[PDB]
Subunit: 239 residues, 8 copies
Amino acid sequence: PGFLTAFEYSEKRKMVFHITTGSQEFDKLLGGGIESMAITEAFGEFRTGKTQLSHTLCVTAQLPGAGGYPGGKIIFIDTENTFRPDRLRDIADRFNVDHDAVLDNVLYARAYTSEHQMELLDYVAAKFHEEAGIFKLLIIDSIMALFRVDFSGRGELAERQQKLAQMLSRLQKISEEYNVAVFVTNQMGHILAHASTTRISLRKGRGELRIAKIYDSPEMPENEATFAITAGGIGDAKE
Amino acid sequence: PGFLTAFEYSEKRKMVFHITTGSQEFDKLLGGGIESMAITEAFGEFRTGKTQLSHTLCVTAQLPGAGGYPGGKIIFIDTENTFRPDRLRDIADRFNVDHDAVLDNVLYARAYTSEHQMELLDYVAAKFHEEAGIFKLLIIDSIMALFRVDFSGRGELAERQQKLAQMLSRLQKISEEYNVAVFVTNQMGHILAHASTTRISLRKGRGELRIAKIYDSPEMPENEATFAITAGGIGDAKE
Amino acid sequence: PGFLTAFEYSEKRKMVFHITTGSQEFDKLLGGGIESMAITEAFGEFRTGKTQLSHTLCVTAQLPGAGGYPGGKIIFIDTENTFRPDRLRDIADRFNVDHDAVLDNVLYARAYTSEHQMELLDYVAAKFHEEAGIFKLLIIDSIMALFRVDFSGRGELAERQQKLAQMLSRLQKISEEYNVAVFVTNQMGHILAHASTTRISLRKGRGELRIAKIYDSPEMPENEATFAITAGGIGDAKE
Amino acid sequence: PGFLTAFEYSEKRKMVFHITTGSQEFDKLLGGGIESMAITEAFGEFRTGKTQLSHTLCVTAQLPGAGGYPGGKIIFIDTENTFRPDRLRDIADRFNVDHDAVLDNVLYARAYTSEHQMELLDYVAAKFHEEAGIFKLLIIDSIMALFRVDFSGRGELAERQQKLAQMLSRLQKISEEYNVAVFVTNQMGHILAHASTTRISLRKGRGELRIAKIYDSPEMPENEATFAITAGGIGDAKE
Amino acid sequence: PGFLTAFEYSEKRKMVFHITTGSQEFDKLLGGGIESMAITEAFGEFRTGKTQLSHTLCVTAQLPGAGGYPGGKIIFIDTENTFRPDRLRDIADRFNVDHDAVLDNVLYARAYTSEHQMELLDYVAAKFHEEAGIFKLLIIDSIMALFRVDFSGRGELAERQQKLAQMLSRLQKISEEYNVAVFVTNQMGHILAHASTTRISLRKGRGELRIAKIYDSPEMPENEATFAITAGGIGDAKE
Amino acid sequence: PGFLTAFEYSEKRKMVFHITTGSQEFDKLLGGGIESMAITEAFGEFRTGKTQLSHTLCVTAQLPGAGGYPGGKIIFIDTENTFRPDRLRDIADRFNVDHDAVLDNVLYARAYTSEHQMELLDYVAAKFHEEAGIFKLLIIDSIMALFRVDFSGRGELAERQQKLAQMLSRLQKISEEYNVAVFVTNQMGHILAHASTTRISLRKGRGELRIAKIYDSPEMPENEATFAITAGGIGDAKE
Amino acid sequence: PGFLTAFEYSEKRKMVFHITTGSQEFDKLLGGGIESMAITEAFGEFRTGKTQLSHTLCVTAQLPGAGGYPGGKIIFIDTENTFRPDRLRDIADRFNVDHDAVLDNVLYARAYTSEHQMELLDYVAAKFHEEAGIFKLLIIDSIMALFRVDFSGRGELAERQQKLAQMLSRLQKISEEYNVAVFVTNQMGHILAHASTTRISLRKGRGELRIAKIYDSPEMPENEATFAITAGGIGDAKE
Amino acid sequence: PGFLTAFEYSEKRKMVFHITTGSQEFDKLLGGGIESMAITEAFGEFRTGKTQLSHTLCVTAQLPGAGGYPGGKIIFIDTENTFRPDRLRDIADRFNVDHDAVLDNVLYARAYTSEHQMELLDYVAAKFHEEAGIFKLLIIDSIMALFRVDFSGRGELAERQQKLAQMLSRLQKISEEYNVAVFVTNQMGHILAHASTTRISLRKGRGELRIAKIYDSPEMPENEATFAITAGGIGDAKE
């Protein structure tokens, strides 16, 4: 049938793995961190760490971890142009790992147009459908931002909202079907809400520390998560 | 004739069966719980149990019960992505039933687009028309939510309201004609009102307990229903 | 000629028969109750008896009565889905009549779409044109309600008001031409006014009793009608 | 020529005859009552006698009267559905005339649609063009009312005002050309003003009596007309 | 050439003749009365004599008068339907003239539609082009009034203002080219202003007398004209 | 080349001649009066002399005058219909000239439509291109007025402003190219401004005298011109 | 390549020559006066000298001057119609030069339509492309003014702004490519701003003197320029 | 694949070179100055140095400097028309370099239309794709300004915003792919924001000095940069 049983489905959910934020109190809000078969969004301020974090996971998703997560290659479509391999080699250190590796470990792609972006997504698939079990994360930062662009004024939102979900769906179908963890940064019943299953909001608690909270995610705790940031990516906020 | 007699019709209504909410005072508002040949809606808050309940019935509709209700397979189209087989095996327990069963007992399907959703509904039929008397519940949560999406702004509601009922009708025609009990969660003379014969409103009475009320349903009692929630699904609220 | 004489017409009006409301003071407002060759509308509140009454007449129109009214079969198109054969067998009693009869005595049909509804009306005809003198009532509750649905927002009322009367005319042409009594419930120079020759408004006078009044009908009395309701349908309100 | 001389025209006006209202002080406002080669309108309240009067003339136009008016057959297109042959036989009495006659004396036709209505008018002609001098009155009550219906909202008045006069002209061309007296009831430089040469306004002076006045008619008197109503139609209001 | 010289033109203006209003102080405002090769308009109140006057000239234009005006046949297109040959025979008297004559002396035509009206005007021509020097007046009352009708709401004035002048021009081209005197009644840089060369405004000075003034006409005097009205048409207002 | 030199152009400007207003202090504002190779406009009140003046020049442009102006034939397109040969013969007198002459001296043409008007202008050319040096003035009064007519409401000004200049250009191209003096009366960066090189405003200084001023014209003096009017056209205002 | 080097470009800029305003303090604001390979605009009041100045340069651009400017022929497209060869011969004097020369020295062309204007510009080219180094100035006064005309109301600015720059570009391409100095008068990020490289604003300092300032031009000084005007064009303002 | 690895990408970023502003405290804000594989924008006031700076870099990008930047040819598309080779030879001095060189060192192109501009950009490519490593800077000042032009009013921004990014993308694809440093001046989630990776805002600190700040750029410091300007381009602001 065009669908499977509950059992046969939970057969799959046993392959749900979390990718560490690199911040224990942050991973706790996500009860593990980034999840698979689920698009996760990054809510923030003008100056947010989402861009920083993206790299962090560019690696964590290589370091084996909890739940017997092996670690795997990655795809980093960069709409904005803030990707910095240099930041990577700066992190692999805090995790004591070969430089050329982490880098040989991340797939990079610049998103220019809002058609290019999906020109890409429909390709990310092929590479996932080619071989499987290798790619554990699909990080696109930021997805939206590039769409507010090619729009035809506040009169053609209709070609945008239509196009936006025409893909955000194709993004969902990837996540759960190919089993990976898709991360996404941006600054916006909004189509990119039901779309993303977990939404993290970010605020700054005075330079060093950052407060991560949830806007809407299954079993969402009322408490916040205090985390810090440094060269070595994201980590715990000590005394 | 393109229609049957009153007698010949009441011949059918004798096959109307209720599926337990798992909460006596809740089943009383529905005078049995979920009904057949009738779409039932779930009104709620940002954080409602409708999503939880859906699973509850994912099972109750397997446990034989009142009115000589046998129990049967099910179809759970999930628009939102909050279906959790794990929650099931956690309930079958409170009802002392084989795990692999309950699961082998539920048909799962993810709704991605608002066309996909009906691509599905027109199929749910085929499986119902293939063999009969097996499927006792059609649970779609949430039906609407996925439609507020593919819409073309607040200018093309016209393609939406048109499309929405183009199906909500096809949903009705299933319920009564194939005799099953269709449950539906959402958060909205509104097309999805005459559409659904029974509308349940949900409010939270301080974490543990929840107050279920009726917005509009035949022989609707003025009183509310106090029920609780736990791992084992929905149940009665004790002292 | 495409029309007949006054005499030849009054030849027909001698076949005008009233169908009892089951409430003497109610039948008096209608000077007999429901009339033939005339669409009668039911104005009411959120919780009105119109739905209850519909069944009442589902029978009364079988019990011979005043003006030498024989009694006959019936057609109950149900847009809403509140038809209850069970309620019937509960009434035939107060009128001491065979159960299987009353039921074998009513033609049932669910209205799903606003096209289906008329798909039906144009058929109700055929059955009336096939044989005559058998069907004494055409009860559609509610006619409107199902139309507020398939509409294309408050911008396409134009396809609705046009479609609505495209039928409400076909409803009139039935009533007078085939000589029957068409009853209709709903909650709205309004097209469904000139359309219906007799309009009854309903208000509730504290649970037990109900006050029926006229909004606009030939020889409309200024006085109201106090009637009650019970399992056995509609009846007089005693001390 | 496509027109005749003044003399040759006054040749025709000598065939102008009035049809009694049955109320002397009313006939005086019209200086005879209803006129020929002239559409007369009936302005009124929710509960007006125009509907009653229509029948009255259904007969008066059979009783020979002033100006050597013979009397003749009639055509009563009924848009509303309030025509009552019974009311006729109740009037012929006050005028001591055969029942079957008065009735055999009136041509009846129900107007359903706003196209039907004219489907009729263009036929009323044929019967007038067939033989002449027999039909002395063309009573359509109400003309407008049925048009406010098939309209396409307050946006397509343009198809209505256009259609309305497309006929109200065809109504005029009948009146003067075939020489008859067309009466019309309704409740509205308005197209149906220049259209109707004589406009009578109606108000109620406490149940029994009614006050008829003129809104706009050649040689319109400033005074009103006090008339009464009973089973025998319209008559004078005594002490 | 497509035009003539000033001399050759004044050759024509020597054929300019005035048609008496029947009121000396009125004829003085027009310095003779109605003029030829010039459309004259009649401005008035709800109850104006313009309709009365029209007949007056229906005759005066037969009585030889000043400037050696012979007198001639006439064309009275009647949009409104207030033409009364009877009123004529009532006037020919005050001018001591054969009845059958005056009447045999006026050409009558009812204007029904706004297309009919011009269907006529383009014909009035033919009769004027056929033979000449016979028809001295073209009286159309009222020209406008019939146009406010067939209009398509206040949205299609564009088909009206366009159509209106499409003719009012054809009316001008008649007046000066065929040399006659066109009179026109109505109640409105307005297209029907430059159109009409002489505009007379009418007010009522207490039943018997009427005050005629000018709104805009070559060599327009500041003074008014006091005139009366009776069976014999329009005349002077004595002590 | 598609243009000539400055010298070769001043070769032409030596043929620039003024046509007397008949009022010295008026001719001074125009430093000669009407000019050639230049459209002159007449701004005024409801009751202005522009219409009177038009005739005045109908002659002055025949009387040889200053700058060795010979005098010549003329073309008087009359949109309004106020041209009066009689007024001419009344002026030629004050200038002691043959009557039949002045008249044989003016070309007359009535403007009916706004298409006719230009139907004419494109012809005035032909007569100017046929022979030259004969026609010294092109007087059109009023140009605009006839255009406010055929317009399609305040929505189609676009067909009007477009059409208006489509000609007012063709009017300019005549003036300078054929060397004549075009006079124009009317009552309005307005298209008919850059269009007309000299704009004269007119006000009334108590019946007898009139005050002519300039709205916008090369070397426009701040002072006004006091002139009078009589049968003999326009002249100086004495003590 | 479709472009040249910086060197090869400065090769051209050595041919940049200024054309004297005839006012030293004015030439200083322009550091020489009018420039080449650059459109210069004239901002002013209702009564501005821009029209006067145009002639001034009609000559200055013939008088050799600073920077070894030889002097050359000129093209004066006149939209407005205020060009006066007479004013020229009045200036050549203050510069002691042959009259017939200065005039034989200026190319004249009247701009009638906004299509004609460019019909011209695309021709001014041909004459510049034919032979070179002869024409040193392209003076169009005023460019805009004629465009506010043929526009289709304030609704079709879109055909105007589009058309306006469709040319103002073709004007730029002339200036720099053929090396000349284009002067332009008018009265308005406005398309005719980036368009013109130097914008001069003009105010009047009491009849005799005028104050020239800059609105926006490379190296624009904060100071103003006091200049006078006389028959001999523009000159310095003495004590 | 349609994209490269992180390593293989950082392989490229090692070719990222900065081009000196000529102002140390300015280069510090950009941590080197202009960057490569990155469009840099210049925010300013009516009178900003962006135009001046453009030349400065027209050279600096020839002087070898930090990070082992060799120096190379350049492309200066000039929309505005303020490019001054003379200013160059005035700068090469402060950097002691051959004049003919610096100039032979810059590629010049005037942007006329908003289609021309891109007609160019798609060519700048060809010259970059022809040979590589020679052109180190692509300076377009100003990009926007020329677009506010050909727009079709505030109604067709839709053709503009669409067209604008249709290129600003093609500009990005050049920068990073061909490795150069694109500088851009102008005065405006705005499409030309995500578009440009580094945005510099400019304010004037009293004639001599200028304060450069950042509006939005990766690792944007809160501090400002005080720099000066002179004939020799941009430089440091001393005591």
